[PDB]
Short mmCIF file of C-alpha atoms in Angstrom, two decimals:
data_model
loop_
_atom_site.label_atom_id
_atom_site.label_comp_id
_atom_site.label_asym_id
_atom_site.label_seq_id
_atom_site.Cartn_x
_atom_site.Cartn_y
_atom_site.Cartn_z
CA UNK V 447 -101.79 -11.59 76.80
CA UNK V 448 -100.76 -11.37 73.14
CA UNK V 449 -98.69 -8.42 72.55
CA UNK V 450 -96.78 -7.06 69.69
CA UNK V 451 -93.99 -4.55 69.71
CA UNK V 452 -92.14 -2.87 67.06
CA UNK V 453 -90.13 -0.02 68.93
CA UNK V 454 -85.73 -1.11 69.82
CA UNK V 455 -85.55 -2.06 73.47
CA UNK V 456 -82.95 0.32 75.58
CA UNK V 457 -80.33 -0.83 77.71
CA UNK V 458 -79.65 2.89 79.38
CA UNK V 459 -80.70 5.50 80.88
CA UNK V 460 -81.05 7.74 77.89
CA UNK V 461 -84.20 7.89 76.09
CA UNK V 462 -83.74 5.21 73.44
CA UNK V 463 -87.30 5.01 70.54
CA UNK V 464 -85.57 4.55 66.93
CA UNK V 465 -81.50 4.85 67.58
CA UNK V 466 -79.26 2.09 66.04
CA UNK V 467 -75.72 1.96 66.47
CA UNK V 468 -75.98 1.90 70.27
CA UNK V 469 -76.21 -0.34 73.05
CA UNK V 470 -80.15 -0.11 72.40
CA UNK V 471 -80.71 -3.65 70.32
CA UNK V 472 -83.77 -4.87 68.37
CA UNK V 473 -86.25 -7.07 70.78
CA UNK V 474 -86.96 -9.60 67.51
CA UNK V 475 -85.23 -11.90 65.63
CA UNK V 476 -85.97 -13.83 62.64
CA UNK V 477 -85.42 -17.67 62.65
CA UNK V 478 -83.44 -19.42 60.65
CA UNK V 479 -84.25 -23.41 59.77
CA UNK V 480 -82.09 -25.69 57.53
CA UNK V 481 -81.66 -29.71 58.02
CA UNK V 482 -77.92 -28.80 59.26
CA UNK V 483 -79.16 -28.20 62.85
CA UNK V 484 -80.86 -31.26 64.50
CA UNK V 485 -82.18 -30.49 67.82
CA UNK V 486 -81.04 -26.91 68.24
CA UNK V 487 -82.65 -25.38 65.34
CA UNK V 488 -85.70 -27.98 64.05
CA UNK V 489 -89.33 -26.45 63.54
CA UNK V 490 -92.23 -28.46 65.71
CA UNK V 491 -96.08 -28.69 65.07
CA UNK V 492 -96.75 -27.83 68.64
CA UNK V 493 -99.99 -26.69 69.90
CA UNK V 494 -101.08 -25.65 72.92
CA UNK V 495 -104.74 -26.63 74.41
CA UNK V 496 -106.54 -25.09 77.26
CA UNK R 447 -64.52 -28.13 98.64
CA UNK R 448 -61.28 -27.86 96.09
CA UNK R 449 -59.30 -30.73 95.27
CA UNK R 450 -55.82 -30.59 92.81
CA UNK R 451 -54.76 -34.20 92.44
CA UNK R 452 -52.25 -34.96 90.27
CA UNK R 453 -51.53 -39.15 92.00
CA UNK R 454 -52.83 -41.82 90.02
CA UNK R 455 -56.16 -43.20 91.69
CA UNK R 456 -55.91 -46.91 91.63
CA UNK R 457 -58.73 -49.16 90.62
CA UNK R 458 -57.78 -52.34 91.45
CA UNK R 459 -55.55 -54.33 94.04
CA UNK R 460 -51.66 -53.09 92.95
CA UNK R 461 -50.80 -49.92 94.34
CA UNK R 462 -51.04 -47.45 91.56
CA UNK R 463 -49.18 -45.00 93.62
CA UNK R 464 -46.87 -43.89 90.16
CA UNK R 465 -47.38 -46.46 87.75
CA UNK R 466 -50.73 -46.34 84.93
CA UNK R 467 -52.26 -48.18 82.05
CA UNK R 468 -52.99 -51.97 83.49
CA UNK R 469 -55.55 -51.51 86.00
CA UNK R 470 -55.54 -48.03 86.64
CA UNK R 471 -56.13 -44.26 84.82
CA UNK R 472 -55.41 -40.94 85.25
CA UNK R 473 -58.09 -39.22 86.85
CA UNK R 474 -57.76 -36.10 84.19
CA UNK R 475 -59.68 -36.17 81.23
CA UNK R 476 -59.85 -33.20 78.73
CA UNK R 477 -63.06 -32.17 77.43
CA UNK R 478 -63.97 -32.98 73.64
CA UNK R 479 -65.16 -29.49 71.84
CA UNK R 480 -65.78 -29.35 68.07
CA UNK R 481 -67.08 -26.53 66.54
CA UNK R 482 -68.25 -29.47 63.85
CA UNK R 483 -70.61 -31.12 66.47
CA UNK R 484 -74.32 -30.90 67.63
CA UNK R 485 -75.59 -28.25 69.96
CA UNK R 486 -75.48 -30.53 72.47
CA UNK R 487 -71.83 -30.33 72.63
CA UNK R 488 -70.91 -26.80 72.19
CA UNK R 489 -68.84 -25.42 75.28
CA UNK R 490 -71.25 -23.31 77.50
CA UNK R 491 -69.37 -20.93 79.86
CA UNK R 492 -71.26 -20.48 83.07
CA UNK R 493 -70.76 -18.18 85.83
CA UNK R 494 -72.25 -18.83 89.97
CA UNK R 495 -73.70 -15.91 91.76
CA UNK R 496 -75.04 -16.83 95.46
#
């Protein structure tokens, strides 16, 4: 199932849709990839077959 | 089970009951954490739940 999602991610009860500031948080993240990090942070030319 | 041992454990023949450093060690070793080392040493801070 590929999905894609734009909208914050709640963490309470209240209706949460576009609200920053609160303990709503973003459900992406953008990575970050420098030869500092070795294992932890390393891009891989992994494919998956089926 | 807990254990606190603070005796020297003897590894050898002599009876390390209060004297180290030939034969024998003390059985407490602190843990090496750099903030300048790999991921695979970073101090992870876990929690049990049964």
């Amino acid at each position: 199932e590929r999905d894609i999602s734009t909208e914050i991610y709640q963490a309470g009860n209240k209706p949460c849709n576009g609200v920053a500031g609160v303990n709503c948080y973003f459900p992406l993240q953008s990575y970050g990839f420098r030869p500092t990090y070795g294992v932890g942070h390393q891009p891989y030319r992994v494919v998956v077959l089926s």
